[PDB]
RNA sequence: UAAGCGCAAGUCAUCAGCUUGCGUUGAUUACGUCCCUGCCCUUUGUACACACCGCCCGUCGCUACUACCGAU
RNA sequence: AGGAAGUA
């Protein structure tokens, strides 16, 4: 924003900064550079971490329960069993996060819902 | 001055390569000898300084040889390229 | 630094990267300057001659290793940011590779420079790649999109993008006949793509879990998939029908990394095969995952 | 009219004319050398044994 | 130069009837004079697609070999210009390597390396001739199929 | 997949809500810039808003791009505006008639990249799941009364605005084969922003055009024109017989269409927010064209 | 219809070779008046040989569907094709073409060719003309690449 | 998918002389080819190889120069 | 100014 505001390197690095940081997941709209001026924040990074984003997806009840579950290794992001509690989850990888394969938690979910299958 | 505008633009491009690499690393990459003969020499209009013309066959064929009919057909062929392009 | 008995060759090892080099100190020249990969590899293949293996990594380079003599003969650096896949055609002239840069680069290996770098219209990051054996058709597939992109080599454009899957397609393979593409996706499904005739048709293979890998029998009548249980299964291709299957979950368990507070035989995450191949006869399979054991099965028994 | 069994090697792509009639390349079965091309109605593939009557037919469309 | 224009009209009126005639030597010479060369390529293609090949010759017909030996400096190097222009085409490469072969057999490596843009000329001839040579070598190794098809 | 398109619905509606939150700071910012440039009168609340000056200097250039017309408006269309070729299905009601399948035949025959499915017995979340997985970028539905059709429902994907419209004055193909080139869209009388939304959901329904010689190349025209919020479409084929004359011909279905609904969200979203509906049974609803 | 084109052109060239071998025997008998009475499709192109007629109508077919029209060829008219590849390899009329389509025709028809006898005699003939043609042209081009090497080293 | 079968609803336009959902049972026969009827596009481009083609054609127009036929 | 023609 210190460039003269008709410039093309401004009008392209605005869209790449905003689209990069939005599709990352830290911003929440990609139409305001003032949102980077006071809305990018280490709390926004930290809420883009993995136990908070699965608390928000309601994979657990609290960040302590979800953190304990992802240090015991029940989760995966995509295809790989993630055991890092600081694993930053991006906005489209907030869809491919679920329980791992032979999960006692997942048998408790299907067991609660009265639809499990030992096959 | 344009030296200040372009020095600022190159410093901002350096900043965006460093920062954009660090962002893709935080997301763990979930973001968005020689030469051919036709590149040594290929026969064309810039290669022929002629009263002839290098054809699409690569062969120079001269207008003085060309009769009424063949100059006629090359007019209608290049005008076919104008009606397409 | 070590130094020759003659005094004519100097040898230098830089320990952070690979970086071994031998240096003639009076005829100032690199008799050797070689380097490994400073990041994890992602793919290897062989030339159909069988004399050189090519491998790609997350370092960004795709490099060409000679089986004899133990050196890399080429290192291609024109991708950035990690190279996922790597393949040849029938011919062994052209090295088709794919990367998270968003691009499938089609290298000319006799001239050591690329024909054609394809990419997708919207920006992607391709994680899987399969070229037709008569190498005039490219298929690639990503995690960001979950359609499958097909380019044409003898034209240069994009021939199609193909539908059908409810998840990121995670293994692509053409048949060595070259009549059938096969997609294996995280919609827990596989897919027979019959492109080349007048009916670009599909034929799904409802599986039990997320498809990790797909490999062809070198005669195209049978195909194997790795799926995320840890189980391999074997399918007829002409009349699409499962013929066999292994549950290899216990066979692959290379157990207890550190930062495992779980025991070695309870970690789900070392109990699946990332990659499978058949042998050139068509009798044994290689199978291997995020683990310690490479697992060599058979097909008939 | 003796019956001569016969099989198929090639399927003759760009030739076949007048409808669904597939014209096909035919390798004889008892003497496994003599190969004529025949006209076949219906769905036919490679490695597909065809039964033909009198083999004095050399015609096409 | 109106009389020179009448000389051009007159010698063109000779060369058309000369190609109508069965002789080719003074159409090679009179076409290296008239400098319109697509029919010069038609003359070398005619002379190598003659029915009569004799003797143990360089191009086919007898006079053409030593009219290439009795051709001059700018005429021969200008012919090297149009043989780097005819060597590129793969349809007229076999009718340019043969008269190019007569040229390299006749003149030595000092007449041909005599000066009058020579480097990239014979470089371009070199690379295109190497391309078509690799093609016909692969054709030879496919002709051993016929060698096998006997027994 | 389903988690992807659900989170894309939710994130899209959230960003649209942030547009409605930033409308007043956008108009206030535009008066700040235009009163910097033009002349000295400026409102003292605008001159006194101290966050507006900083967020101004960070956010000038995108409003410059709007006034210049550079950037594209966030929408259910402009993600893939004119690059992708929109595949569009057509289907009917459950047990269609002879006249209804013939009408389906001629309206898939109207759009070029329009496939036609037999209905059969296909549960409608399997229509949106089927077109959701094989990326039919628009489906249109058909409804009859006794074969003579009475409604269409265009509805496109992943979550785009469906339009529900009744159907009047329908003449089919008469006694006697129609070309399929990329057609010529004209739209007459869409003066309002609702007219701009229905004109956008009709003009991204057809295959786009390479912009070089669209003015002359092509012989097929498709004409939408509204009198009294009841749009028209005819289908004509034309040969331009001079440089100043043209000969048209009616080629297909003589068509008029009364839209009664514009619902954001797809064909299954019978709970999602409409943007428009016919206000019959209000008392001054029959005196307005667009709303 | 392209396989019909090379079928009927192959037959017209075959009867053309029949008329010039009858006339060639008769002019080996005497210089008496012996009318060859050639075909009024050959005389419209100008008393051409069957080599350039059948060669040009094999160059009309575009070489994607060359193996299609070539692959519909029946075993009845395979031998006349081998006769004209004997002539094309004799007088050297586009030897990558007669190599290429020769090797398609044998590469399909091995067991009929290796089971026959007469086309192994004419196959011996086209072996001789083919090997002499590729041999000669290969030797010319090798001499030219050597000569271009010596001149380019000479500068 | 075609075809049979009932059930439910009546959602501001349309629809009870019916409309629209919903389940139940569920095949034969093509799934190849452009030969017939057509429709679209090639012979210009769009990046580059190892490979391959080898100058598509007819009828008027627009201009530029050269020289005429008949008035003034 | 018109009429008819050539070449590029």
Angle formed by the axes of helices A8-24 and B2-26, nearest 10°: 10
Contact, C206 vs C187, CB < 8 A?
Answer: no
Q: Is F139 exposed, middle or buried (0-12, 13-18, 19+ CB in 10 A)?
A: buried
DSSP sequence for G78-140: HHHHHHHHHHHHHHTS-HHHHHHHHHHHHHHSHHHHHH-SHHHHHHHHHHHHHHHHHHHHHHH
Count other Cβ atoms within 10 Å, centred on residue G133: 24
| The token pair that represents G149 in the structure block | 């090497």
Q: In sequence order, what are the residues at sequence separation of 6 or more whose Cβ sits closer than 8 angstroms to the Cβ of residue C265? A: C253, C255
Distance CA G79, CA G118 (A): 9
| The token pair that represents B81 in the structure block | 């390229």
The dihedral built from the CA positions of residue C50, C53, C54 and C56, taken in this order, carries a sign that is positive
- DSSP assigned state of F113: T
Contact, C227 vs C209, CB < 8 A?
Answer: yes
Which residues of G, range 73-132, sit inside 8 Å of E by Cβ? 91-96, 99, 102-103, 106-107, 110, 113-114, 120, 123-124, 126-127, 130-131
Distance CA F208, CA C236 (A): 42
With residue G70 as reference, give the H or E element that holds it.
helix G66-71
Tell me: cis bond preceding F158? Omega within 30 of 0 counts: yes
Across the interface, which of A81, A92, A96 has its CB nearest the CB of C268?
A81
Distance CA E64, CA E45 (A): 13
Across the interface, which of A9, A17, A20 has its CB nearest the CB of B9?
A9
The dihedral built from the CA positions of residue G11, G15, G21 and G24, taken in this order, carries a sign that is negative
Q: Is F232 exposed, middle or buried (0-12, 13-18, 19+ CB in 10 A)?
A: middle
Contact, F119 vs F91, CB < 8 A?
Answer: yes
Contact, C205 vs C193, CB < 8 A?
Answer: no
Give the three-class secondary structure for C40: coil
Distance CA C30, CA C24 (A): 7
Angle formed by the axes of helices E119-150 and G118-154, nearest 10°: 160
Distance CA D52, CA D50 (A): 6
Tell me: cis bond preceding A33? Omega within 30 of 0 counts: no
Distance CA E7, CA F253 (A): 74
With residue C162 as reference, give the H or E element that holds it.
strand C158-162
Give the three-class secondary structure for C193: strand
Which alpha helices (DSSP H) does chain E contain, by range?
2-20, 25-34, 38-48, 62-69, 73-86, 97-106, 119-150
Distance CA F264, CA C120 (A): 29
b (16+ CB within 10 A) / e for E39-55: bbbbbbbbbbeeeeeee
Contact, C84 vs C170, CB < 8 A?
Answer: no
In angstroms, what is the C-alpha Rg of chain A?
19
Distance CA F154, CA F194 (A): 16
Distance CA F278, CA F262 (A): 10
Resolution to one decimal, Å? 3.2
Cα diameter, chain C: 71
Distance CA A65, CA A67 (A): 5
Distance CA B65, CA F285 (A): 81
Count other Cβ atoms within 10 Å, centred on residue C107: 24
Task: Report the residue of G3, G71, G106, G113 to disrupt the D interface, i.e. the one with the largest count of D CBs within 10 Å.
Answer: G71
Distance CA G123, CA C282 (A): 39
CB contact under 8 A, B30 and C102: no
CB contact under 8 A, G96 and E136: yes
With residue G145 as reference, give the H or E element that holds it.
helix G118-154
Distance CA G86, CA G96 (A): 14
Edge-first strand listing for the sheet containing C29-34:
C2-3, C9-13, C20-24, C29-34
Q: Which nucleotide is nearest to E127 (CA to C1')?
A: H50
Task: Report the residue of B58, B66, B70 to disrupt the E interface, i.e. the one with the largest count of E CBs within 10 Å.
Answer: B58
Please give the method by which this entry was determined: cryo-EM
**The three-state (H, E, C) secondary structure of chain B, written as one string:** CHHHHHHHHHHHHHHHHHHHHHHHHHCCCCCCCCCCHHHHCCCCCCCCCCCEEECCCCCEEECCCCCHHHHHHHHHHHHHHHHHC
Long-range Cβ contacts of G117-123 (<8 Å, 24+ apart): G118/G79, G119/G78, G119/G79, G119/G82, G120/E149, G120/E150, G122/G79, G122/G82, G122/G83, G122/G86, G123/E146, G123/E149, G123/E150, G123/G82
CA of D20, C1' of H36: distance in angstroms: 12
Residue A50's φ and ψ, nearest 5 degrees, are -80, -45
Q: In sequence order, what are the residues at sequence separation of 6 or more whose Cβ sits closer than 8 angstroms to the Cβ of residue A28? A: A22, A35, A39, F14, F15, F18
CA-based nearest residue to F87, from F152, F131, F130: F131
Which alpha helices (DSSP H) does A41-84 contain, by range?
42-46, 50-56, 63-72
CA angle C219, C220, C223 (to 5 degrees): 110
Distance CA D26, CA D46 (A): 10
- DSSP assigned state of A80: B
CA-based nearest residue to F161, from F259, F34, F285, F35: F259
Contact, F101 vs F92, CB < 8 A?
Answer: yes
In angstroms, what is the C-alpha Rg of chain E?
18
Residue B72's φ and ψ, nearest 5 degrees, are -60, -50
Distance CA C276, CA C224 (A): 8
Which residues of B, range 4-63, sit inside 8 Å of C by Cβ? 24, 29-34, 36
Count other Cβ atoms within 10 Å, centred on residue G136: 13
Residues in chain B closer than 8 A to C100 (CB atoms) = 29, 31
Angstroms from F132 CA to nearest CA on chain C: 9
Count other Cβ atoms within 10 Å, centred on residue G151: 20
- Helix%, strand%, coil% for chain F, nearest 5: 30, 25, 45
């Amino acid at each position: 924003s210190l460039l003269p505001p008709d410039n093309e390197v401004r009008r392209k690095h605005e869209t790449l900064l905003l689209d990069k940081l939005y599709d990352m997941g830290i911003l929440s709209t990609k139409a305001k550079l003032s949102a980077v001026e006071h809305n990018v924040t280490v709390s926004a990074f930290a809420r883009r971490r993995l136990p908070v984003v699965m608390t928000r997806l309601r994979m657990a009840e609290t960040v302590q329960a979800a953190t304990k579950l992802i240090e015991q290794g029940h989760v995966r992001v995509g295809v790989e069993e993630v055991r890092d509690p600081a694993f930053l989850v991006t906005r489209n990888m907030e869809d491919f996060v679920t329980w791992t394969v032979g999960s006692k938690i997942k048998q408790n979910i299907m067991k609660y819902r009265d639809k499990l299958d030992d096959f | 001055a344009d030296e200040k505008l372009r020095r600022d633009e190159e410093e901002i491009k350096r900043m965006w390569k460093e920062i954009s690499a660090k962002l893709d690393a935080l997301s763990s990459w979930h973001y968005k000898s020689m030469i051919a003969p036709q590149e040594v020499y290929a026969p064309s209009k810039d290669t022929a300084e002629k009263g002839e013309v290098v054809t699409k066959a690569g062969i120079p064929i001269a207008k003085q040889e060309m009769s009424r009919e063949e100059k006629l057909r090359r007019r209608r062929r290049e005008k076919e390229r104008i009606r397409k392009a | 630094v070590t130094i020759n008995k003659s005094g004519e060759w100097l040898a230098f090892g830089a320990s952070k990267l690979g970086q071994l080099l031998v240096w003639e100190w009076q005829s100032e020249s690199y008799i050797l300057k070689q380097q490994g990969h400073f990041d994890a590899m992602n793919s290897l293949v062989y030339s159909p001659d069988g004399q050189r293996i090519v491998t790609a990594a997350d370092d960004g380079k795709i490099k060409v290793w000679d089986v004899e003599s133990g050196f890399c003969i080429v290192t291609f650096t024109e991708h950035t940011s990690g190279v996922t896949a790597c393949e040849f055609a029938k011919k062994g002239s052209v090295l088709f590779t794919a990367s998270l840069d968003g691009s499938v680069r089609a290298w000319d290996l006799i001239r050591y420079r690329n024909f054609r770098t394809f990419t997708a219209p919207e920006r992607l990051s391709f994680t899987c790649m399969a070229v037709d054996p008569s190498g005039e058709v490219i298929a690639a597939g990503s995690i960001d999109s979950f359609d499958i992109h097909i380019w044409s080599v003898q034209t240069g454009q994009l021939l199609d993008r193909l539908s059908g899957h409810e998840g990121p397609v995670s293994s692509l393979a053409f048949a060595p006949d070259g009549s059938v593409l096969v997609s294996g996706s995280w919609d827990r499904t596989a897919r027979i793509w019959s492109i080349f005739s007048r009916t670009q048709t599909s034929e799904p293979l409802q599986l039990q879990s997320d498809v990790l890998d797909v490999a062809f029998r070198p005669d195209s009548k049978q195909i194997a998939i790795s799926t995320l249980d840890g189980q391999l299964t074997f399918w007829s291709v002409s009349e699409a029908q499962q013929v066999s299957g292994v549950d290899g979950r216990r066979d692959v368990s290379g157990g207890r990394r550190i930062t495992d507070r779980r025991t070695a035989a309870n970690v789900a995450g070392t109990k699946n095969f990332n990659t499978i191949r058949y042998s050139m006869d068509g009798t044994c399979l290689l199978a291997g995952g995020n683990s310690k054991y490479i697992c060599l099965y058979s097909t008939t028994t | 009219a003796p019956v001569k069994f016969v099989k198929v090697t090639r399927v003759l792509g760009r030739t076949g004319s007048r409808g669904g009639v597939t014209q096909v390349r035919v390798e004889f079965m008892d003497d496994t050398t003599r190969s004529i091309i025949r006209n076949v109605k219906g769905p036919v593939r490679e490695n597909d044994i065809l039964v033909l009557l009198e083999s004095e037919r050399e015609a096409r469309r | 130069a109106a009389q020179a224009a009448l000389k051009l009209v007159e010698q063109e009126q000779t060369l058309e009837n000369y190609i109508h005639a069965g002789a080719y030597r003074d159409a090679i010479v009179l076409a290296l004079q008239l400098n319109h060369p697509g029919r010069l390529l038609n003359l070398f293609t005619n002379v190598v697609t003659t029915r009569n090949p004799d003797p143990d010759s360089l191009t086919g017909l007898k006079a053409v070999d030593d009219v290439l030996a009795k051709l001059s400096d700018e005429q021969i190097f200008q012919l090297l210009l149009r043989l780097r222009d005819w060597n590129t085409n793969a349809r007229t490469a076999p009718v340019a390597q043969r008269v190019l072969w007569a040229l390299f057999k006749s003149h030595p490596a000092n007449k041909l390396s005599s000066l009058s843009s020579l480097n990239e000329v014979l470089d371009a001839i070199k690379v295109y001739t190497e391309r078509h040579y690799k093609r016909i070598e692969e054709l030879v190794d496919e002709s051993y199929l016929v060698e096998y098809t006997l027994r | 997949m389903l988690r992807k398109q659900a989170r894309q619905r939710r994130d899209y509606l959230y960003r649209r809500a942030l547009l409605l939150r930033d409308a007043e700071i956008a108009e206030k910012r535009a008066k700040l810039r235009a009163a910097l440039a033009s002349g000295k009168p400026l409102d003292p609340k605008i001159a006194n808003d101290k966050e507006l000056r900083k967020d101004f200097d960070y956010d000038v250039s995108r409003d410059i791009a709007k006034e210049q017309g550079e950037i594209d408006i966030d929408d259910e269309y402009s993600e893939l505006s004119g690059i992708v070729d929109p595949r569009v299905l057509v289907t009917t009601s459950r047990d269609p008639s002879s006249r209804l399948m013939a009408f389906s035949k001629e309206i898939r025959l109207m759009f070029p990249t329009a496939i036609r499915l037999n209905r059969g017995n296909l549960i409608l979340p399997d229509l949106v799941m089927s077109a959701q997985r094989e990326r039919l970028s628009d489906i249109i539905l058909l409804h009859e009364h006794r074969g003579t059709p009475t409604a269409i429902t265009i509805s496109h994907f992943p979550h785009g605005p469906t339009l529900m419209a009744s159907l009047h004055n329908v003449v089919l193909r008469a006694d006697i084969t129609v070309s399929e080139s990329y057609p010529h869209l004209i739209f007459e009388g869409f003066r309002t922003p609702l007219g701009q939304r229905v004109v956008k959901i009709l003009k991204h329904l057809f295959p786009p055009r390479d912009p070089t010689n669209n003015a002359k190349s092509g012989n097929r025209v498709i004409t939408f024109v509204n009198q009294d919020d009841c749009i028209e479409v005819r289908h004509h084929v034309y040969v331009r017989t001079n440089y100043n004359s043209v000969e048209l011909s009616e080629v297909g279905p003589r068509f008029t269409m009364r839209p009664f609904s514009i619902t954001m969200g797809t064909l299954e979203n019978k709970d999602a927010d409409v943007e428009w509906h016919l206000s019959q049974y209000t008392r001054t609803g029959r005196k307005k064209n667009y709303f | 219809m392209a396989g019909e084109r090379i079928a009927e052109a192959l037959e017209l060239g075959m009867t053309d070779l029949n008329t010039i071998r009858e006339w060639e025997e008769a002019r080996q008998i005497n210089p008496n008046i012996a009318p060859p009475q050639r075909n009024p499709i050959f005389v419209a192109l100008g008393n051409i040989p069957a080599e350039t007629y059948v060669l040009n109508t094999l160059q009309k077919i575009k070489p994607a569907s060359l193996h299609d029209a070539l692959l519909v060829l029946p075993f009845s008219t395979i031998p006349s094709l081998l006769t004209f590849l004997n002539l094309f390899a004799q007088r050297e009329l586009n030897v990558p073409l007669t190599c290429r389509i020769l090797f398609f025709v044998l590469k399909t028809h091995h067991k009929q060719i290796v089971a026959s006898r007469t086309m192994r005699a004419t196959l011996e003939k086209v072996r001789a003309n083919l090997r002499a043609a590729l041999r000669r042209q290969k030797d010319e081009m090798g001499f030219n690449i050597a000569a271009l090497k010596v001149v380019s080293m000479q500068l």
